[PDB]
C-alpha cells in the first residue's frame, strides 16, 4: 500500500513500486503568495500546466569509488523550457519544487545513498591549502547547471559542516535492499516574497553514498542514477527583454 | 527632591543582566514579517532529530574519514562474538561528539531524560542474521562474553523487509539531574556501556557479498531536558580571524 | 614512519614462505592501508594485497586461494604468507603505506630480493 | 506607546515611548517537534510495521 | 468565468496548509506503567529509517516501566534564554604611536562575524530577527582608567563617513551620537531591527549584481547588502593630540529573537570574515578517536 | 581489471630538449599517478591527481589530461632526471600500473 505510488502533474507520469513513502519539507505544501505578504503592484503572470511539468536531467554512474554531487535549484531549470524561458524573461520568481531520485539495481547488490535538501548551500575553498589564501570558488562551481558538481571533501560537505548532522534537513535514504526510489516535496524558502531567478539559488541537493556500493563478478557493474523535478505554484513578475545571465 | 540611598552593587555591568535601555532612533517602525517555512521555538525540538552517531571513530588520516561513519559485520565462527562497544555518555568525549545530541549538550551542564539508538542494516537483499544489543548500567564492568552481556537490558535484532531497530536506553540514576561525566571524580555521573554482539550468524548465498555495514542514529526521548546553559568547550579559533 | 623488510633470501620450491616488515613512528592500527607489492625481474609490477587499520583484508584475484595477510599490533608488524610456491614467484617484494582510493601518506619501504 | 517590537515575549518592563526598549520577558512554552522529526505525508502509529 | 476548468481550479490559493500545530509542553513527559507483552502482529522495536523520520519507540513499548511524575521545566531551553547574553563582537585600538589608527580616530563596519563563539552560535540557524543592546567600555591598553572625553557616532549607509578628527560630519545634526567619559559607566543602548528584509541573513547563496561573473569580481559571492547596516565611529573630543592611549571593546545582546531553518554547526576553524573558508590540508574529525572499535 | 598502456616504450633525449610521455586507460579514471624510479632503489610518487608535484620534486615537471588520455611532460631535461616512469590508477581494486618508459 505504501510501497506503490504514481506522481500525476501537467502532462507528465511516474510510476513505481519500491517506495518509501512521501517526505513534504518542513510540514508545509506549496502555496501562492498572499496580498499581505505582497510588494510588487504589478499583476503577475500564473503559466499552470505549461511551467508546473516533469522535468529529466542527465545521468550519473555509481561506482565504488564515488563520492557524491550536488544541484543548485532553481539554477538547474534556467535553460530548459517554457519554465526557463519565463525564468529568463521575468525580473521575479517564486514557486516551490517536487523532487524525484532513480536508483534500482538487483537483490544481490548493496550499498545506500543519502539524499537531502539544504536551503542556502554556500561553496568554500580550501584557502590555498595552508588556511593563509583568500581565494574564491569560480562561477562554474557555484552555479553548475544541469549538470551539477562532484564534491571534492564531502566529510565537510566543502563548507566546514559535519555531514553527519545532515540529517536535520529534509531527506530520505534509497537503501537498496529496500527501495529504489526517494520523493521530496519543498515549499518555497526565502526571506523575501519574491526574487530574481539567475542571481540567487534558494537550495542545494545534495546525494552522497554512506555505504560503498559492491557486488560479485559477473553481475551488472553499471548503477545508473536519475533526478527527476517538477515546479509547483509558479509565479513571474516584472516583464522585459530576455537576459540570459 | 526625592531623598534615596545607593546600595552597593552600582555601576557594575553584569552581561546577563535583564534592563531597559534607551532607545537610539525614535518613532522607528521595522519591515512587516512574512510567513518563512520552519520556524523554531525551543531547542529541544532539535534534540528529538535523529543524527549520525561515529562508533567506529579510529582512523584519522584524510582519505578515511568518511569510513567513521560506518562499521562492518561478516560471518564468524558461531561462538557469540564481540562486534562494538562504547559509552553512552552523552555529552562525553567519543562518539557522541558527532551528534547534533551532543553539540547542544556541550553547551548545557546538567541533563536528564532518556535516549535511543536506531541501527540500519545495508546488506543485500540475500543476507540474514540476527544480533544482540545490550545495555550496561552503571557499576558492571565491560562485559566479557554474551552471556555476561545478557543480564542487562538488551534486545534481540532480527534481519528482514524492516531493516532497522531502536535501542532505548532508560533513564537509570539515583540523581535527578546527571552533571557531564569525565575521568576522575566526576567518573560518578557515568551513564553506562552498550556493546553488540553475534546471535546466531552472518549469513548469505553464493554470489551475494562477504561483507556488510551497520549505520548507527543517535536522538532523544519526550522527557529529555537540560539546564544551566554555559559556554561550549572548544573554540573554533587559533588566532584573529582577518 | 619508516618501513623495513625482512625475511629468508632463498626458498625452495613447493615450500611455505614468510615475510615481515617493521613499521616505526606510527602505530598501524592509527589508519592508513598497508600494502604488499612485487617488481618482477622484467621490470614489471604487480599490486598482491593489503591489510586495513581495523583487521580488514582484500586480495588479488589472480593470487586467491595462495596469499594470507596478517598483523601483530604488539609488536607493530604485519606479516605475508604464499603457499606453495613455484619458480615464477621470484621477485623484489615492497611494503608500502596507502591511502583509501587516494594518495595519502603513500611512502615505500626498500624492498627485499627472493629467489626460488 | 509605539507598537514597533520585532515580535509584535508577553510580559515585559518598559519607561519609554518605543517598545524595541523593553525587557526581554517570559514567552510561552509551546512546541512543535513533529515539524522536523516525523514530516511524513501519511502517519504511521507506532504498533504496526512502517512499511 | 464559464468553462469548466477555471472554475474548478485551485490557481491563487495563498492559504498554506500545515500538517503539524504546536502544543503546550512546560514540563518534560511522565511516564507510565506497562507490564510485559506477549503477542503477534505489533512490533513497536522495529522501524524502517530510509522513510526520514526519527522512531517512534517509547520507554514502556520496551521495558516493564513504573509510574513516574515528571516536573522539570523546559523554560531554559527558548530562544531568548539561549542568546540573551551579552558577547564580545568588536574591539577598536587608538594608539598614541603606530600606524593602525594615529590621529585620534576610527571606523568600524558593524558585523558581529570576528570572533568564534558569537559566530558559532547564531550560524545554527539560517534567518533570524531580533533586537539588540549594545554596551562600550573603554580603557588604557593596561586596564587603567583615564580622564578623557569619547564622542560615538552611528553612521547609516549613504551618510558621509567623517575622514578626520575635525570633520565637518562631527557636529551630528540628524546621525544618532553618544557623548561619554571614561570614568563613567560603561555606555548602553537600544537598537531595533533595521534591514529591508524580513530577517537578516548568516548565509546568502547568491551575487548581489547581474552581469558576466568573472574571476575578478568572485570577491563579490556570499554578500548580501540586506545585512549591511552601517558604520561605527569613535573619536577623541578635541582640537588637539589626546594624551592616553585607548581601547573601546563592544558587546552585544539580543532581545524578542526569532529564527528559522537549522543547520549543522560549524566544524572547522573560522578564517575569514563572511566566508565558511577552511584549511584543506588540516582537515581533523569532530570528535577524539581511541585505538579499537572492541575497547574502551 | 584496469589496463593502462604507456607509449613510447624507449624515449631518448638531449639537455634542455623537451619530453612529453603518454599513458592511456581503458576506461574513464577520475585521476592518474606516476612514480619515479632510479636503477637499485624503489619507485618514489612523482605526480599525484596530475597535477600536484610530490614534495621534494623540480618545478620543471607538470602533468595534464583527462577522461581515458593522460599526459607527463619536462620542460628541460637534465642528466639528474633519467629513469623509468610509470602510470597508476587508484579507480578500482586491483591496483594496476603501467608498462613504464626508459628515458
Ligand atoms: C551611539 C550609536 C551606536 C550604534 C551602535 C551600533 C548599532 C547598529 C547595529 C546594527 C545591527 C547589527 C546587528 C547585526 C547585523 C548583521 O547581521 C551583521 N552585519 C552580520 O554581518
Not at chain 2, 115 to 135: D, H, N, P, Q, R
Not at chain 2, 137 to 162: N, S
Not at chain 3, 82 to 100: M, W
Amino acid at each position: 500500500s505504501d510501497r506503490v505510488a504514481q506522481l500525476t502533474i501537467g502532462n507528465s507520469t511516474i510510476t513505481t513500486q519500491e517506495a518509501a513513502n512521501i517526505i513534504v519539507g518542513y510540514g508545509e505544501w506549496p502555496s501562492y503568495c498572499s496580498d499581505s505578504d505582497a510588494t510588487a503592484v504589478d499583476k503577475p503572470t500564473r503559466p499552470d500546466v505549461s511551467v508546473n511539468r516533469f522535468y529529466t536531467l542527465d545521468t550519473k554512474l555509481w561506482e565504488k569509488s564515488s563520492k557524491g554531487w550536488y544541484w543548485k535549484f532553481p539554477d538547474v531549470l534556467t535553460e530548459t523550457g517554457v519554465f526557463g524561458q519565463n525564468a529568463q524573461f521575468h525580473y521575479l520568481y517564486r514557486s516551490g519544487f517536487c523532487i524525484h531520485v532513480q536508483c534500482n539495481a538487483s537483490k544481490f547488490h548493496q550499498g545506500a545513498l543519502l539524499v537531502a535538501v539544504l536551503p542556502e548551500y554556500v561553496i568554500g575553498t580550501v584557502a590555498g591549502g595552508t588556511g593563509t589564501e583568500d581565494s574564491h570558488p569560480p562561477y562554474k562551481q557555484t552555479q553548475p547547471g544541469a549538470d551539477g558538481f562532484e564534491l571534492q571533501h564531502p566529510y565537510v560537505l566543502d563548507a566546514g559542516i559535519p555531514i553527519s548532522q545532515l540529517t536535520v534537513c529534509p531527506h530520505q535514504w534509497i537503501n537498496l535492499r529496500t527501495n529504489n526510489c526517494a520523493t521530496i516535496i519543498v515549499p518555497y524558502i526565502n526571506a523575501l516574497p519574491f526574487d530574481s531567478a539567475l542571481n540567487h539559488c534558494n537550495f542545494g541537493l545534495l546525494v552522497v553514498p554512506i555505504s560503498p556500493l559492491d557486488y560479485d563478478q559477473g553481475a551488472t557493474p553499471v548503477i545508473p542514477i536519475t533526478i527527476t523535478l517538477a515546479p509547483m505554484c509558479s509565479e513571474f513578475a516584472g516583464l522585459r527583454q530576455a537576459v540570459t545571465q | 527632591g526625592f531623598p534615596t540611598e545607593l546600595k552597593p552593587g552600582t555601576n557594575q555591568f553584569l552581561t546577563t543582566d535583564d534592563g531597559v535601555s534607551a532607545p537610539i532612533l525614535p518613532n522607528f517602525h521595522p519591515t512587516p514579517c512574512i510567513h518563512i517555512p520552519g520556524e523554531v521555538r525551543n531547542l529541544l525540538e532539535l534534540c528529538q532529530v535523529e543524527t549520525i552517531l561515529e562508533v567506529n571513530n579510529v582512523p584519522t588520516n584524510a582519505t578515511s574519514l568518511m569510513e567513521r561513519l560506518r562499521f562492518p559485520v561478516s560471518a564468524q565462527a558461531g561462538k557469540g562474538e564481540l562486534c562494538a562497544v562504547f559509552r553512552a555518555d552523552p555529552g562525553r568525549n567519543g562518539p557522541w561528539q558527532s551528534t547534533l545530541l551532543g553539540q547542544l549538550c556541550g553547551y548545557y551542564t546538567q541533563w536528564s531524560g532518556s535516549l535511543e539508538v536506531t541501527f540500519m542494516f545495508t546488506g543485500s537483499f540475500m543476507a540474514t542474521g540476527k544480533m544482540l544489543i545490550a545495555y550496561t548500567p552503571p557499576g558492571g564492568p565491560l562485559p566479557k562474553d554474551r552471556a555476561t552481556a545478557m543480564l542487562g537490558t538488551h534486545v534481540i535484532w532480527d534481519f528482514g523487509l524492516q531493516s532497522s531497530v531502536t535501542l532505548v536506553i532508560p533513564w537509570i540514576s539515583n540523581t535527578h539531574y546527571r552533571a557531564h561525566a569525565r575521568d576522575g571524580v566526576f567518573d560518578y555521573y557515568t551513564t553506562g556501556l552498550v556493546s553488540i554482539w553475534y546471535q546466531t550468524n552472518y549469513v548469505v548465498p553464493i554470489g551475494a557479498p562477504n561483507t556488510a555495514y551497520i549505520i548507527a542514529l543517535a536522538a532523544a526521548q519526550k522527557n529529555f531536558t537540560m539546564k544551566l546553559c554555559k559556554d561550549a568547550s572548544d573554540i573554533l579559533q587559533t588566532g584573529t580571524i582577518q | 614512519v619508516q618501513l623495513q623488510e625482512s625475511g629468508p633470501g632463498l626458498v625452495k620450491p613447493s615450500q611455505s614462505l614468510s615475510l615481515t616488515c617493521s613499521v616505526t613512528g606510527y602505530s598501524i592500527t592509527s589508519g592508513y592501508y598497508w600494502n604488499w607489492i612485487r617488481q618482477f625481474p622484467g621490470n614489471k609490477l604487480e599490486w598482491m594485497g593489503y591489510i586495513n587499520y581495523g583487521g580488514s583484508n582484500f586480495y588479488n584475484p589472480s593470487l586467491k586461494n595462495r596469499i594470507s595477510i596478517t598483523r601483530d599490533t604488539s609488536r607493530n608488524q604485519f606479516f605475508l604468507k604464499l603457499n606453495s610456491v613455484t619458480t615464477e614467484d621470484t621477485a623484489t617484494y615492497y611494503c608500502a603505506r596507502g591511502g583509501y582510493y587516494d594518495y595519502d601518506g603513500d611512502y615505500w619501504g626498500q624492498g627485499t630480493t627472493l629467489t626460488v | 506607546e509605539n507598537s514597533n517590537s520585532a515580535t509584535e515575549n508577553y510580559t515585559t518592563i518598559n519607561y519609554y515611548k518605543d517598545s524595541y526598549a523593553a525587557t526581554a520577558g517570559k514567552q510561552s512554552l509551546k512546541q512543535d517537534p513533529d515539524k522536523f522529526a516525523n514530516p511524513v505525508k501519511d502517519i504511521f502509529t507506532e504498533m504496526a510495521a512502517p512499511l | 468565468d464559464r468553462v469548466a476548468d477555471v472554475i474548478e481550479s485551485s490557481i491563487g490559493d495563498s492559504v498554506s496548509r500545515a500538517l503539524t500545530h504546536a502544543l503546550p509542553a512546560p514540563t518534560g513527559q511522565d511516564t507510565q506503567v506497562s507490564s510485559h507483552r506477549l503477542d503477534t502482529g505489533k512490533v513497536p522495536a522495529l522501524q524502517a529509517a530510509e522513510i526520514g523520520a526519527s522512531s517512534n519507540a517509547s520507554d514502556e513499548s520496551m521495558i516493564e516501566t513504573r509510574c513516574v511524575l515528571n516536573s522539570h521545566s523546559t523554560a531554559e531551553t527558548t530562544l531568548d534564554s539561549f542568546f540573551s547574553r551579552a558577547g564580545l563582537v568588536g574591539e577598536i585600538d587608538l594608539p598614541l604611536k603606530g600606524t593602525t589608527n594615529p590621529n585620534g580616530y576610527a571606523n568600524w563596519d558593524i558585523d558581529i562575524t570576528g570572533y568564534a563563539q558569537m559566530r558559532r552560535k547564531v550560524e545554527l540557524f539560517t534567518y533570524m530577527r531580533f533586537d539588540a543592546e549594545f554596551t562600550f567600555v573603554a580603557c588604557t591598553p593596561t586596564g587603567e582608567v583615564v580622564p578623557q572625553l569619547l564622542q560615538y557616532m552611528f553612521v547609516p549607509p549613504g551618510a558621509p563617513k567623517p575622514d578626520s578628527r575635525e570633520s565637518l560630519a562631527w557636529q551630528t545634526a540628524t546621525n544618532p551620537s553618544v557623548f561619554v567619559k571614561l570614568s563613567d559607566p560603561p555606555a548602553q543602548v537600544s537598537v531595533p531591527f533595521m534591514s529591508p528584509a524580513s530577517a537578516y541573513q548568516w548565509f546568502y547563496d547568491g551575487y548581489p549584481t547581474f552581469g558576466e561573473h568573472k574571476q575578478e569580481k568572485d570577491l563579490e559571492y556570499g554578500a548580501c547588502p540586506n545585512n549591511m547596516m552601517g558604520t561605527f565611529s569613535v573619536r577623541t573630543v578635541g582640537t588637539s593630540k589626546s594624551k592616553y592611549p585607548l581601547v573601546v571593546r563592544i558587546y552585544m545582546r539580543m532581545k524578542h529573537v526569532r529564527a528559522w531553518i537549522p543547520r549543522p554547526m560549524r566544524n572547522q576553524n573560522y578564517l575569514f570574515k563572511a566566508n565558511p573558508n577552511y584549511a584543506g590540508n588540516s582537515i581533523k574529525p569532530t570528535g577524539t578517536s581511541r585505538t579499537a572499535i572492541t575497547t574502551l | 581489471q584496469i589496463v593502462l598502456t604507456q607509449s613510447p616504450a624507449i624515449m631518448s633525449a638531449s639537455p634542455g630538449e623537451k619530453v612529453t610521455i603518454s599513458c592511456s586507460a581503458s576506461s574513464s579514471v577520475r585521476y592518474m599517478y606516476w612514480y619515479q624510479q632510479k636503477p637499485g632503489s624503489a619507485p618514489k610518487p612523482w605526480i599525484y591527481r596530475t597535477s600536484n608535484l610530490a614534495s621534494g620534486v623540480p618545478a620543471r615537471f607538470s602533468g595534464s589530461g583527462s577522461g581515458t588520455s593522460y599526459s607527463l611532460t619536462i620542460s628541460s631535461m637534465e642528466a639528474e632526471d633519467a629513469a623509468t616512469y610509470y602510470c597508476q590508477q587508484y579507480h578500482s581494486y586491483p591496483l594496476t600500473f603501467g608498462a613504464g618508459t626508459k628515458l
